[PDB]
Amino acid sequence: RVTESIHKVAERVVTLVSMELPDNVRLIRDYDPSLPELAHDPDQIEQVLLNIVRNALQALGPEGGEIILRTRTAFQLTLHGERYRLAARIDVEDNGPGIGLGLSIARNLIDQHSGKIEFTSWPGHTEFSVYLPIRK
């Protein structure tokens, strides 16, 4: 409904997560300042990111680690079979020795925004990538 910077929601998430962050877990930012403002429901995107970050905290477990909240402009990104000239990619990547309804809710809220969520992993890392359309 509103067209604003996705970083406002990202920062609301950083503030909220501070209350549940273990002493041995650090949350770092890796924002792309060139990312354009986009239409989205801030309340819904906040819930999407909170649930993904909590899943990340669950993955890290007692061993703790690092969670990176990253934003990047995505060019020529495909969403539901159509290629978009511009989309926003928001990643929640965790690093840790020790490596759900919330996730289902996040998926549904992203579908409402006509976006997608992808999961990947590599040695010592796991990452959820959320995509939101900006310009088709």
Q: Give the CATH number, domain containing residue 18.
A: 3.30.565.10
Sign of CA dihedral 54, 10, 34, 131: positive
DSSP code for 63: G
Q: β-strand 116-122 against 125-135: which pairing, if any?
A: antiparallel
Distance CA 78, CA 57 (A): 29
Distance CA 16, CA 52 (A): 13
From the centroid of its chain, how far is CA 46? Answer: 9
One-letter identity of residue 126: T
Phi-psi category of residue 39: left, alpha or beta, with phi > 0 → left and psi -120 to 50 → alpha: beta
Q: 115 lies in which domain range?
A: 1-136
Domains in the chain, number? 1
8 Å CB contact between 67 and 24: no
Within the chain, strands assigned E span 2-4, 25-30, 38-40, 65-79, 82-95, 116-122, 125-135
Distance CA 40, CA 24 (A): 33
Given resolution (angstroms):
1.6
Beta-carbon contacts of 110 under 8 Å, excluding residues fewer than 6 positions away, are: 48, 116, 117, 130, 131, 132
Q: β-strand 65-79 against 116-122: which pairing, if any?
A: unpaired
Write down the number of H helices and E strands in the chain: 3, 7
Distance CA 78, CA 124 (A): 28
Residue 8 marked as a ligand binder: no
Sign of CA dihedral 16, 18, 19, 22: positive
Beta-carbon contacts of 91 under 8 Å, excluding residues fewer than 6 positions away, are: 68, 69, 70, 71, 72, 127, 128, 129, 130
8 Å CB contact between 1 and 41: yes
